[PDB]
């Protein structure tokens, strides 16, 4: 809204990053790394083949690596006797790294409002179920 640029900004911007690698030859020093959500809609010239020879794809971590992230945030957390770390990892399905610490934050605030030392297992159960479905519960149409 505030800063637009019009249709002419697309040509002078995306091609300016190309003119940095295309307009200069630097053997060993400058290493340009580009990152965004979707690189497909970008200009194939902006990709500048031959400078970037490696394509790295991102995927969500599996259940084996979730215990390493969960154990760090729960290292300073007081857990009850009925709370198991293997249960929260199995419940998580298609979640990012910030979603692991989100359930620990939500379950920690529930016991903080009630002033409890060890967080009860009921807070962990309500955290993993709620954070699972919040924004989009249904496909809204058909089964897909």
């Amino acid at each position: 809204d505030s800063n637009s640029g019009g249709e002419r900004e697309i040509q002078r911007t995306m091609l300016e990053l190309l003119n940095q690698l295309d307009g200069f030859d630097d053997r060993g020093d400058v290493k340009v790394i580009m990152a965004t959500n979707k690189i497909e809609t970008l200009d194939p010239a902006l990709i500048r083949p031959g400078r970037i020879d490696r394509k790295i794809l991102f995927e969500n971590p599996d259940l084996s690596t979730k215990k390493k992230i969960l154990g760090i945030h729960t290292s300073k957390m007081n857990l009850s006797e009925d709370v198991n770390l293997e249960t929260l990892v199995t419940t998580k399905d298609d979640l990012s790294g910030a979603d692991i610490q989100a359930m620990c934050t939500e379950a920690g605030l529930l016991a903080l409002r009630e002033r409890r030392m060890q967080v009860t297992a009921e807070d962990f159960k309500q955290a993993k179920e709620r954070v699972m479905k919040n924004k989009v519960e249904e496909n809204l149409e058909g089964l897909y």
């Binding site: 199995t90 399905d93 058909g142 089964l143 897909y144």
Partner: protein, 240 residues
Amino acid sequence: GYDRALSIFSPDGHIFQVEYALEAVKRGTCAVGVKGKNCVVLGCERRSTLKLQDTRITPSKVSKIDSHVVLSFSGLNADSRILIEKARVEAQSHRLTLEDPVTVEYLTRYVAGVQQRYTQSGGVRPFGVSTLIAGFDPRDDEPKLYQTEPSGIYSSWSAQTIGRNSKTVREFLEKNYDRKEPPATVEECVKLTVRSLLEVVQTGAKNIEITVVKPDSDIVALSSEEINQYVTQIEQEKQE
């Protein structure tokens, strides 16, 4: 007459609107088709996670086009219901005109033609559902497992899955099911079918439905209590 069909043709030769019909498989419920020596088994996934949902009155993804032929699909139930109705009308028309039973190879040519005719012609949107047609040839016990893609092409597969995480399940099919020596026993084909559904259903019971097709027009669906009998044996094999 509405439009010519699909404009712009896409730059890559495959229209995005046609690609959206193919990419619709990678999200919705998974259906793992398999076949053995003497029979064929088509697995399906119906989500019971929603509470107060009656699973008895809700038909599963398995539909019988012919006495010896069934059909399994993953996608929109509305677009697939037409594929079920139009196939059964042709299934009866084939038995009316030629007096012979429904040919598994010929039936898929018409079902793929339904999605083809609506995709080629204009004004009609292409279907976003893919169906797995499995049946037995007349006077033959060898199962035939085919597939009808919304792009208008058909292909045969020994073991093929449709649904989310299909690439992971496809690796489970190649590393276990062997085209040269498939499992002869029915119990082995049912247990390995549920194991393929464990990567999607993720430890569930009512979400797994197994349908076994036997020759001489014999088709029975395993009850929820009978499915848990095979799942119990799978849980014992995980610790081994």
